[PDB]
């Protein structure tokens, strides 16, 4: 497991440019990044597909349901701080 805190920043008329899904693991909800659009605020901050989002602005989002994490991120405005968890095979 690697861990990295990212800070994403966008303009008002603009999305962060990533998508998430929430998996009910065996139930512990884990939310991870399923897509990141190229050259988006997300990409530039270092966000990568497969990253688990463990925290949003120091809120532990592990165990949180999908709708709440979406609302949390949307409530964050234009600055978003994500603790990511990831690893690579190679
Ligand atoms: Cl949405």
In degrees and rounded to multiples of 5, residue 39 shows phi and psi of 60, 25
CA dihedral 23, 90, 37, 72 (to 10 degrees): 40
* Resolution at which this structure was determined, Å: 2.1
CATH number where 4 lies: 2.30.42.10
Query: DSSP class of residue 67?
Result: H
Compute, in angstroms, the gap from residue 47 CA to the centroid of ligand 1.
18
Compute, in angstroms, the gap from residue 38 CA to the centroid of ligand 1.
19
Q: How far apart are CA 86 and CA 56, in angstroms?
A: 16
Compute, in angstroms, the gap from residue 70 CA to the centroid of ligand 1.
7
Compute, in angstroms, the gap from residue 4 CA to the centroid of ligand 1.
24
Compute, in angstroms, the gap from residue 25 CA to the centroid of ligand 1.
22
Based on the structure, what is the number of domains in the chain? 1
Per this entry, what is the length of the chain?
90
User: What is the domain extent for residue 19?
Assistant: 1-90
């Amino acid at each position: 497991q690697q861990r990295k805190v990212l800070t994403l920043e966008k303009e008002d008329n603009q999305t962060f440019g990533f998508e998430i899904q929430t998996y009910g693991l065996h139930v512990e909800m884990v939310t991870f990044v399923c897509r990141v659009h190229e050259s988006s605020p997300a990409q530039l901050a270092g966000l990568t597909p497969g990253d688990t989002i463990a925290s949003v602005n120091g809120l532990n989002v592990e165990g949180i349901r999908h709708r709440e994490i979406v609302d949390i991120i949307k409530a964050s405005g234009n600055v978003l701080r994500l603790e990511t968890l990831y690893s690579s095979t190679l």
